[PDB]
Ligand binder design. Sequence first.
Ligand SMILES: [Zn+2]
Ligand SMILES: [Zn+2]
Length: 151
Amino acid sequence: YEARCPCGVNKDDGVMILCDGCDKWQHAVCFRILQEGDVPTSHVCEICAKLKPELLRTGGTTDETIQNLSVEARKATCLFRRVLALCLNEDSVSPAFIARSLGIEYTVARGLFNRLIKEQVIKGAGPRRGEKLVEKEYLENIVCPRFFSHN
Ligand SMILES: [Zn+2]
Ligand SMILES: [Zn+2]
């Protein structure tokens, strides 16, 4: 059993999806999948989509938004998706909590925290210094559909 995911953190968290091409697991949210019903019949990771494109013509589905990005741009997108999903299940966050939860370095977590402020997902002081409260309804009803809609 192996996790191999372009967020760069090769550890199970949340809903995991199996690539039909390499038999490694990715975080569903990294691949733009939040609801279990949006898990494809045959998931294809970003590596297999480029090594074996026939997988995509014979029933497989990749996340076309990250497939051809650079390593660094893809990692930043996937990690931000993970932090959005974390916020869906929490009342407040901080860089340190983000770092622990996602398995990443503090400085990277702080960048994700800062982007949450810009996307207006967090606002208002939490109980502890450095924490901000999640705008729960705004996240669920408005922000999340910007990133995770399948229509
Ligand atoms: Zn991931
Ligand atoms: Zn694969």
